[PDB]
Amino acid sequence: AASTYTENNILNALLRGVAFPLPAKTYVSLHTGDPGVGAGANEVSLSNWPAYVRREAEQGGAIGSGWTPAASGQTSNVNQLTYPANNGVAAVTVTHYAVFDAPTGGNLLFKAPLTVARTLQVGDVFVFDVGSLTAQ
Amino acid sequence: AASTYTENNILNALLRGVAFPLPAKTYVSLHTGDPGVGAGANEVSLSNWPAYVRREAEQGGAIGSGWTPAASGQTSNVNQLTYPANNGVAAVTVTHYAVFDAPTGGNLLFKAPLTVARTLQVGDVFVFDVGSLTAQ
Amino acid sequence: AASTYTENNILNALLRGVAFPLPAKTYVSLHTGDPGVGAGANEVSLSNWPAYVRREAEQGGAIGSGWTPAASGQTSNVNQLTYPANNGVAAVTVTHYAVFDAPTGGNLLFKAPLTVARTLQVGDVFVFDVGSLTAQ
Amino acid sequence: AASTYTENNILNALLRGVAFPLPAKTYVSLHTGDPGVGAGANEVSLSNWPAYVRREAEQGGAIGSGWTPAASGQTSNVNQLTYPANNGVAAVTVTHYAVFDAPTGGNLLFKAPLTVARTLQVGDVFVFDVGSLTAQ
Incomplete structure (x- = not known):
């Protein structure tokens, strides 16, 4: 469940040892269908969900407050992400x-x-409960 | 198939944003039993293999020639890895x-x-053929 | 015991003073019989040994570590050299x-x-020990 | 019969890749005792030979006129070298x-x-004929 960009980056950093790009900010997105595995997704929810701003994790924090420190893997959504409600249609x-x-x-x-x-109905907030969004 | 140390580092770099540690040199190891996955391994073969000088990938090169470029996965050990022959015992x-x-x-x-x-018998080299040690 | 080309360059540099070409990379080979002394050899082993990529000294190193610094003559292969195994036939x-x-x-x-x-039998690596290949 | 300096330089140039110091100008000197092959000779004849100014080869040409080009070895001091006559003692x-x-x-x-x-008597120019002082 790793995209070709991140998989290539981690393999190169571990084996080549070349510079590893550092994500300064993390933005979580909602997609009706699964992404290709490539950059972007197939496809993002647009033209039907007018309010589709990606809820950035750790809104108050600058970097690193989104998820718990790594300890034998696992991550948790420390700050609750509340997506904008569906506008309508x-x-x-x-x-x-x-x-x-x-x-x-x-x-x-x-x-x-x-x-x-x-x-999601005409009106739904679609919050993400804390402790989820774990990765291995 | 990933150690906790490297898993912690990759998770930190991907999500938390900590600077990703980068090896100065790459050393391959041979272990009689599977590594403990944590700090250290179970176990390093010494006093049974009199000559076990670990064979570094890219023996003379500084960095960058260890593996084939990562593109949608896959790696290949560019330079043939040949361990010193089993002395005896x-x-x-x-x-x-x-x-x-x-x-x-x-x-x-x-x-x-x-x-x-x-x-490994009394006398053998135990080379790793080029195209092995692949990483996904 | 030295080839004519090397003889030409050594004598020409020592006496006339023209530029001495510097080998960018050094390759070690095997020949079934005595080489001519001229350009090429009689004869190189090929099509009997399907994998015969010529091993470079300081396999990854740029230059200057393939052979030890000279001290009143003599040098030794710093990195152990291992040829590909005899494929068959x-x-x-x-x-x-x-x-x-x-x-x-x-x-x-x-x-x-x-x-x-x-x-060499059907399967052999035919390595070179460190301290061998001494050249005055 | 090549001394340390030339031997170390040629070996480094051939194997290590270090540049060969090129002699901008070549002198011929005579010694009473056999050279030790180390730095200097053992020993130069001085204070017994007041006029011992080392006759350079290729007196007329700037460079490259002293010796014929290498052809599978062999050389010749093309310019005739005439030493000053011994002053006395x-x-x-x-x-x-x-x-x-x-x-x-x-x-x-x-x-x-x-x-x-x-x-060498009280009077002798001690001239070198062309074709002497070969190199190999």
Whole structure:
């Protein structure tokens, strides 16, 4: 569940030892379908969800406050992410959650499906409970 | 198949944003039993293999020639790795290989079982053919 | 015992004063019989030994570490040299080694008989020990 | 019969890759005793030979006129070298000649015993015929 950008980066850093790009900020995105594995997703929820601003983790913090320190793996959403409510028109379903380095494009850190499929009505806040969004 | 140390570092770099540690040199190791995955390995073969000077990848080069460029995964050990021949005494059986930062200890990057069981007789070189030690 | 090209360069540099070409990389080879002394050899082992990539001294090193600094003559292979294993077919007899500027052709630096003629079986690596290949 | 300086330089140039110091100008000097092959000779004839100014080869040409180009070895001092006549005092026996890059000191490339032992009277120019002083 690692994109070709991040997989290449980690392999090169571990084996080549070349400079590893450091994600200054982390932006979590909601996608109706799974990303390709490439940069971006196929496809982002647009033209039906007018309020689709990517909720940046650790809103108060600058860097590193989004997730718990690594200890035998695992991560947890320390700060709760409250996505903007669906504006209207048609219902939008969320089945995959993806972490993006940039709010717009900017590579795909992790690509992971949701545990349960959720369909958002005309009005839904779709918060993410703390302690989730773990990675191995 | 990833050690906790390297897993902690990659998770920190990807999500938390800590600067990713980068090896000064790459050392390959041969272990009779699979590494403990934590600090150190179980176990380093000494006093059974009289000459076990760990063979560094990219023997003369500074950095960059260890593995083929990472592109949608896959690696290949560019330079043939040939360990000093078994001096004598008792036979050594190997089933795992681990990548170390330092010639002694220095944390553990990878661990993976050998495809086929291989044993070392009285006198043998035990080279690793180019195209092995691949990383995904 | 030294090839004519090396003889020409040594004498010309010592007396006339023209530029002395510097071998960018040093390659060690094997020949079944005595090389001519001229450019090329009679004869290089190929099509009996399918994998015969000529091993470069200081395999990764740029320059200056392939052989120890001279002290009233004599040098030794700093990095242990290992040729690819004999893929198959029949036995090969190696008696003379040559030092090459280029992997293919490109002058003869040294030619020298081995200590004793060595016969390689179906599968053999035929390594060079550290401290061998001494050249006055 | 190549001294340390030239031997170390040629070995480094051929194997290590260090640049070969080129002699901008070549001197011929004569010594009563055989050279030790080390720095300087053992010993230069001085204070017995007041006029011992080392006749440079290629007196007319700037460089490259002293010796014929190398052709599988062999050389010749194309320019005839005529030493000054001995001023006086005692007879000096000339047995060994050496090549110098500098008029005083400045390394010793070649040491060579002379084929016939020559005793120098009160008067002798002690000239070298063309075709003598070969190199190999």
